Amino acid sequence: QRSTSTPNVH
Amino acid sequence: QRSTSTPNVH
Amino acid sequence: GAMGSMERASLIQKAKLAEQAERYEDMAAFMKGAVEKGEELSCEERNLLSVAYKNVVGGQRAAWRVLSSIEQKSNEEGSEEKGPEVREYREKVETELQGVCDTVLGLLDSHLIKEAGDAESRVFYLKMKGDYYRYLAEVATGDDKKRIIDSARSAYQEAMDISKKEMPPTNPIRLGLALNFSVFHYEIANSPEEAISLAKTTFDEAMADLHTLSEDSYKDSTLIMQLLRDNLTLWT
Amino acid sequence: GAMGSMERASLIQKAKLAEQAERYEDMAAFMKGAVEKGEELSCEERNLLSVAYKNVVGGQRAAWRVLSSIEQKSNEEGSEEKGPEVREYREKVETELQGVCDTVLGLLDSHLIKEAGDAESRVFYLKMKGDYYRYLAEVATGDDKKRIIDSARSAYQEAMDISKKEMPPTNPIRLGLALNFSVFHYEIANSPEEAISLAKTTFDEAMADLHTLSEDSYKDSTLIMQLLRDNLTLWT
Ligand SMILES: *SCCC(=O)N1CCC(O)(c2ccc(Cl)c(C(F)(F)F)c2)CC1
Ligand SMILES: *SCCC(=O)N1CCC(O)(c2ccc(Cl)c(C(F)(F)F)c2)CC1
Ligand SMILES: [Cl-]
Ligand SMILES: [Cl-]
Ligand SMILES: [Mg+2]
Ligand SMILES: [Mg+2]
Ligand SMILES: [Mg+2]
Ligand SMILES: [Mg+2]
């Protein structure tokens, strides 16, 4: 499983 | 709600 | 054509890779290249062509509906006028959608349909022709909406005539054609009673033939029969 | 540039429409056109640029991983050799991904970063530079993988130096930068201990500052803090 990066915020 | 048409089958 | 230098078999291989990668624009371009090699398509290859373009036009249809809704709202009493941009962008997406439909219809006319003699291939292609005229109808508003609807109707009808003569009532090609023609009647042609009657008769005639089927074929047929039922539940 | 004839404000309006329609390639093209007008971007406009390109490159990264996995499997003892097509198509997608990264890096270098003097804009852009070098690093294998990694590292480090001087430890820009730099350390730079230490210190320093925040800001900060925690749970 890959690390979580900053997601989009609409 | 729109009617259902034939879906893709992979 | 940019696929003219690639082997037919390589185009089909890459269409399958694009499908796995959910790269449906690529998948459609690969399949267009394969069709333009000029050989008829196998059942698996016809399905790849259909899957690719249905996904491409499906994204466009979804986007077009979002933009058309925004435009319709912008055009109502009490809506602050916001300039030409919504219309412009809806028109851009609409033109791209019509282009995809025209490309598919072009492949069917040059020359998939005329070379398709078996019922399974010919009905598949005529159903596709009806489907892509139906997608054109969904966005048509000018003089040609009537003629686009009639073109869809004519293709579906030719397909139906062949399917009823040449295919059992549980055949999945026949069932999906009837499903989509019933959608045409309800959503495009303002004929909900015809849509209901077609869906009901199709369902009932398939039910009566299920006893002839293997487990695997029974699963295929009943899955499409469920979609007919879903629509009948929506429509009634 | 095909957007050269469109008003800046119209490009931003259409970027927002494209976002609503989930048409992220269009959204990115509109925002590229807006950037190329040469004026600095507001915080909402910077966010539109980021959302658009992150969605575009995200689809490419997902597709590239699927194709690279297939290629790796095809290249193992006992794998029936199937020709050059998997490699060719993986290379096609990889080249398109690198192109998107190069386009974003080009906009940052010409001239978003050099005109960005406030901490909130400058840190945002330097983080973006680190992010798109990191996406390049994910597919790099030749001579330049080391130099690509160092470019990512350098951009993140400049951004970190500014954020620690100029922003409170709960600031969402600062928190997301630290999150992404920790991902760089773990996933790219083979430095999991640095990744863990950064994520832990970032989380703890933000926790201690939450008492200063409004309800709305508390929600923003704790959402990103949760992502740091998720990674620490994955990593330990
Ligand atoms: S091989 C030429 C026909 C073809 O390729 N078809 C016809 C109809 C099928 O749509 C189909 C088959 C089985 C099921 Cl369960 C479904 C559906 F229920 F719609 F998922 C569709 C596939 C393509
Ligand atoms: S206005 C310049 C900064 C900017 O536009 N940003 C910085 C970080 C934000 O990512 C952000 C804000 C709030 C939340 Cl809850 C998140 C996240 F938790 F990741 F969803 C991210 C948005 C863009
Ligand atoms: Cl437009
Ligand atoms: Cl290729
Ligand atoms: Mg008013
Ligand atoms: Mg039009
Ligand atoms: Mg073998
Ligand atoms: Mg390469």
* HSE-CB of C15 using CA atoms within 13 angstroms: 27
Which residue, among D132, D136, D156, D154, has the nearest Cα to D144 in the 3D structure?
A: D136
Which residue has its alpha carbon closest to ligand 2 atom 3?
Answer: D173
Distances (CA, A) of C213 to C27, C172, C175, C221, D59: 33, 12, 15, 9, 41
Looking at this protein, which amino acid is placed at residue D188? Answer: I
Q: Tell me whether residues C62 and D22 touch, CB distance under 8 A.
A: yes
Looking at this protein, which amino acid is placed at residue C221? Answer: S
CA–CA separation, D17 vs D35, rounded Å? 17
Which residue has its alpha carbon closest to ligand 2 atom 7?
Answer: D173
The residue assigned the tokens 């029969």 is: C225
- Phi, psi values for residue C42, rounded to 5°: -70, 170
| Highest CATH level, class, for D8-235 | mainly alpha
| 3-state secondary structure at position D37 | coil
Neighbour tally for D152: CB within 10 Å: 24
Chain D residues in contact with C86 (beta carbon < 8 A): 17
Name the structure determination technique.
Answer: X-ray
C208: tokens are 């009566």
How far does the CA of residue C10 sit from the closest CA of chain D (Å)?
Answer: 6
Chains contacting C with at least 3 CB pairs below 8 Å? B, D
Ligand 4 geometric centre to CA of D62 (Å): 17
| 3-state secondary structure at position C23 | coil
Distances (CA, A) of D215 to D204, D205, D212, D219, D220: 19, 18, 10, 6, 9
Q: Where are the alpha helices (DSSP H) in chain D?
A: 8-20, 24-35, 43-74, 85-107, 113-115, 119-139, 145-166, 172-183, 192-207, 215-235
The residue assigned the tokens 């992502």 is: D227
Task: Tell me whether C70 touches chain D (CB under 8 Å).
Answer: yes
Task: Tell me whether C81 touches chain D (CB under 8 Å).
Answer: no
Question: 3-state SS of D71-101?
Answer: HHHHCCCCCCCCCCHHHHHHHHHHHHHHHHH
Which one of the ligands is nearest to D81 CA?
7
Burial D160-190 (b: 16+ CB within 10 A, else e): bebbeeebebbbbbbbbbbbbbbbbbbbbbe
H/E stretch holding C113: helix C113-115
How far does the CA of residue C182 sit from the closest CA of chain B (Å)?
Answer: 9
Q: Which residues contact D180 (CB under 8 A, 6 or more apart)?
A: A5, A6, D127, D130, D131, D134, D156
How far does the CA of residue C64 sit from the closest CA of chain D (Å)?
Answer: 8
Resolution of this deposited model, Å: 1.6
CA–CA separation, D208 vs D199, rounded Å? 14
Q: Tell me whether residues C180 and B4 touch, CB distance under 8 A.
A: no
Task: Tell me whether D66 touches chain C (CB under 8 Å).
Answer: yes
Q: Do C182 and C157 form a contact (C-beta atoms < 8 A)? A: no
CA–CA separation, C198 vs C43, rounded Å? 26
C165: exposed, middle or buried (Cβ count in 10 Å: 0-12, 13-18, 19+): exposed
CA–CA separation, D46 vs D107, rounded Å? 12
D77: tokens are 């003892």
Return the ∠ at Cα C213 (arms to C211 and C215), rounded to 5°: 110
CA–CA separation, C235 vs D218, rounded Å? 48
Please give the DSSP secondary-structure letter assigned to residue C209: T
DSSP string, A1-10: -PPP-PPP--
The residue assigned the tokens 């050269």 is: D4
Q: Which residues contact D141 (CB under 8 A, 6 or more apart)?
A: none
Q: Which residue among D50, D123, D124 is best mutated to probe the pocket of ligand 2, counting the most ligand atoms within 8 A of its Cβ?
A: D124
Ligand 8 geometric centre to CA of D97 (Å): 10
Ligand 1 geometric centre to CA of D36 (Å): 48
Please give the torsion angle defined by the CA atoms of residues D48, D52, D58 and D59, in that order, rounded to the nearest 10 degrees.
150
The residue assigned the tokens 């999150």 is: D179
Q: Where are the domains of chain C?
A: 8-235
The residue assigned the tokens 């000018």 is: C142
Pocket of ligand 2 (CB under 6 A): A 6-7, 9; D 43, 46-47, 120, 124, 172-173, 176, 220, 223-224
Which residue, among D39, D72, D31, D87, has the nearest Cα to D55 in the 3D structure?
A: D31
In this complex, which of D50, D187, D224 lies closest to A2 when CB atoms are compared? Answer: D187
Which residue, among C67, C43, C212, C39, has the nearest Cα to D23 in the 3D structure?
A: C67
> How many residues does this entry show for chain C?
236
D166: tokens are 């100029």
Q: Is the CB of C131 under 6 A from ligand 1?
A: no
